[PDB]
């Protein structure tokens, strides 16, 4: 209901023994879940806030060399020191100059010279680390009550926030029972090696190991108003002209430099604390306490009119908005599907048992008709309704699209991708272990290698497999090559 025609949402059906279904909740997308008898529900993750941050290694992306000083010494007289050398704010190096009788030194040759300067910092870019104590996720569960204002609505639902301390949570529903969540945030995204970087009004997440190797001055991040910057030499640059004197420049500001650098990073909009979007999290749905809500209700007999025309989504789902006529009883609208000239019921009703709670407000009934011609019946009377609809897709096309979606999910979620629709079974566990070993090997072997290099290595490996007589090696390397092509094509998204 919340998830209708948004971010290639899928529907994971089936329940294990004792009715736990495992689901990984990709952020920026969502899932829906039908059941044997329990009402269907859709879950979407959003607003993984992270609060109570800590600041360390604030860098500096600009300079202002205010005071400049110099000193010289005659050749073969040692290196000329400068009194402004031992302060915690001056950076300089020694260079050699040629001195003569025209410069005040009797001995001809090469002499020492220094040029030291104070280094004010401007526009610091503080680096913030996040700790798991204060992290908070938020998942919104919506039931398919078929309300008038329920389709594609981001507001309706019940928030069930989860924290790495209190992993378990039971979401209370309005007269539906309780839903049991056992999501695990200590896996999925790992913020131990991910550091939030905030500059100006924008923020980012960069891998920690990469956040100390980018060359810029850095400081303790104690915001004590007088930061003594480590490695000041990197930003300021000395130029020595053809022999003679020596002068110092500022090398401008690194704003666009940093903006260019953070190509592969994600975006985290921080207004109050931080609101990390583009998340990822695995969940478990303990679905025991889901009332069908329509056991006692009866199939009413009055006629039905529809407000808007029949419409479908990207997937095999049609959304029907029907209205009830003049009978006061809140009933259980029946449903059936028919063929062209024959009578065969095949169209699955994707939602729960639709119920008209009130006479005035319509109900949004959505379902999955079969491929080809479809006829829809919305009552027991002869004149209830007739909705004829033609679906375009084909079974092989649906299987191909499902495999494409599965491969896409595997590319991003990697080793945990098997857990997405996983129902407790040995084969899923075996594939999980095998793919986890292979993924560790692959990510370890390809770390930081970019997409163009991935595609080049893949095509080269495919060729080296196409011209070999060692059959087992040929097939192993060709499989690795094809996987490499696919990962290179899919990466960056």
């Amino acid at each position: 209901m919340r998830c209708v025609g948004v971010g290639n949402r899928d529907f994971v059906e089936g329940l294990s023994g004792a009715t736990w279904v495992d689901v990984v909740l990709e952020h920026g997308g969502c899932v829906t879940t039908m059941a044997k008898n329990k009402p269907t529900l859709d879950i979407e993750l959003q607003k993984t806030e992270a609060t109570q941050l800590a600041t360390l290694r604030k860098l500096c992306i600009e300079g202002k060399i205010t005071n400049i000083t110099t000193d010289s010494r005659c050749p073969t007289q040692g290196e000329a020191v400068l009194p402004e050398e031992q302060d915690q704010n001056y950076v300089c190096k020694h260079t050699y100059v040629d001195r003569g009788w025209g410069n005040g030194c009797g001995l001809f040759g090469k002499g020492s010279l220094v040029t030291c300067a104070k280094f004010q910092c401007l526009e610091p870019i503080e680096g913030k680390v996040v700790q798991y104590e204060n992290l908070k996720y938020t998942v919104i569960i919506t039931v398919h009550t078929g309300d008038q204002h329920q389709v594609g609505n981001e507001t309706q639902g019940v928030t069930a926030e989860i924290t790495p301390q209190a992993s378990t949570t039971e979401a209370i529903l309005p007269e539906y029972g309780t839903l049991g969540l056992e999501c695990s945030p200590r896996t999925g995204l790992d913020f131990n090696e991910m550091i939030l970087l905030t500059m100006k009004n924008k923020a980012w997440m960069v891998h920690r190991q990469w956040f100390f190797d980018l060359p810029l001055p850095w400081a303790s991040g104690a915001t004590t108003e007088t930061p003594t910057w480590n490695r000041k030499e990197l930003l300021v640059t000395f130029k020595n002209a053809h022999a003679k004197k020596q002068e110092v420049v500022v090398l401008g500001s690194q704003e666009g430099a940093m903006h260019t650098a953070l190509t592969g990073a994600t975006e985290i909009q921080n207004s109050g604390g931080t609101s990390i979007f583009a998340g990822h999290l695995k969940c478990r749905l303990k679905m025991d306490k889901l009332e069908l809500k329509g056991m006692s209700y009866a199939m009413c007999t009055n006629t039905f009119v529809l407000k808007k025309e029949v419409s479908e989504t990207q997937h095999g789902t049609i959304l029907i908005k029907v209205e009830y006529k003049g009978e006061d009883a809140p009933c259980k609208i029946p449903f059936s599907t028919e063929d062209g000239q024959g009578k065969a019921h095949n169209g699955r009703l994707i939602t729960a048992n639709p119920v008209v709670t009130k006479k005035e407000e319509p109900v949004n009934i959505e379902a999955e008709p079969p491929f080809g011609e479809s006829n829809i019946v919305i009552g027991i009377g002869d004149n209830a309704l007739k909705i004829n609809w033609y679906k375009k897709g084909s079974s092989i096309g649906k299987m191909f699209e499902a495999t494409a979606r599965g491969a896409r999910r595997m590319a991003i979620l990697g080793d945990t991708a098997w857990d997405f629709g996983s129902v407790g079974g040995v084969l899923n566990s075996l594939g999980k272990m095998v793919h986890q070993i292979f993924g560790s090997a692959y990510t370890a072997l390809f770390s930081g290698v970019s997409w163009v290099m991935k595609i080049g290595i893949g095509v080269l490996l495919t060729w080296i497999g196409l011209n070999s007589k060692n059959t087992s090696m040929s097939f192993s390397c060709i499989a690795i090559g094809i996987i490499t092509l696919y990962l290179g094509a899919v990466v960056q998204a």
Partner: antibody, heavy 122, light 109 residues
Framework: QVQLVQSGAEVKKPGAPVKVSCEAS????????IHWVRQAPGQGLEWMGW????????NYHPRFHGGVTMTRDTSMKVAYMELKRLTSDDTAVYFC???????????????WGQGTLVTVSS | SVLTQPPSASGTPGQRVTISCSGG????????VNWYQQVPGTAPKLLMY???QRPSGVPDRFSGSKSGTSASLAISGLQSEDEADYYC???????????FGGGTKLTVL
């Protein structure tokens, strides 16, 4: 000392361009900013745009791009602003102020002039 | 966003009155606020050339800072000669322009 003469107030008719000259001597003009803040009678003053004398271009307030133009000269250390179109709205005194290039100093308007006044009528 | 500060009244006996400046998450919550007071009809002078640093304004009685999305100014021992309109201006970094406020009509009895 450092100051801005801002010439003298002049008033004109709608549909013609008016000029407001603004000279600041006494210091190296190149490094610092000129901000050109407008102030209406009995209303708050809003800033429009910088001009870097050495290499700067116009960076007007979003309300005023294509409504005003800013020029300058380095030899005489003067910044020129002119109104390409006078409607009935712009009936106010236009100012000058020295600004720093610091990120925290973009609003640093330390020194101001007298304020050249222009009003429009028939 | 945009900043809006309220006009208010006060009296000539010394008392702490707070000129609060309210902004957003991109204009004043990260940048240095600037406080101006203008004697009416002439060129406004600058009252605070940093977040809490005054260049030459009336010392020891004009001091204030900012908290999160809000910036404030505090005046002590306010007499009649301090009749002025007080302005808070912050640099907006999203829109690449400074954000001046509407203005406070601080009248002192």
């Amino acid at each position: 000392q450092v100051q801005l003469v801002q010439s003298g107030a002049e008033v004109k008719k709608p549909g013609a361009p008016v000029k407001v000259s603004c000279e600041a001597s006494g210091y190296t003009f190149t490094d610092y900013f000129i901000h050109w803040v407008r102030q209406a009678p009995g209303q708050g003053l809003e800033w429009m745009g910088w001009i870097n004398p050495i290499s700067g271009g116009t960076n007007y307030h979003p309300r005023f791009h294509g409504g005003v133009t800013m020029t300058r000269d380095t030899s005489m250390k003067v910044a020129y602003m002119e109104l390409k179109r006078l409607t009935s709205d712009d009936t106010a005194v236009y100012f000058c102020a020295r600004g720093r290039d610091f990120r925290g100093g973009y609003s640093q308007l330390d020194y101001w002039g007298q304020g050249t006044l222009v009003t429009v009528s028939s | 966003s945009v900043l809006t500060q309220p006009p208010s009244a006060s009296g000539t006996p010394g008392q702490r009155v707070t000129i609060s400046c309210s902004g957003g998450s991109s204009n004043i919550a990260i940048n240095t606020v600037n406080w101006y007071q203008q004697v009416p009809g002439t060129a406004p002078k600058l009252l605070m050339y940093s977040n809490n640093q005054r260049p030459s304004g009336v010392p020891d009685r004009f001091s204030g800072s900012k908290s999160g999305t809000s910036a404030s100014l505090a005046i002590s021992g306010l007499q009649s000669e301090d009749e002025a309109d007080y302005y808070c201006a912050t640099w907006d970094d999203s829109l690449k322009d400074v954000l001046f406020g509407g203005g406070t009509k601080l009248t002192v009895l």
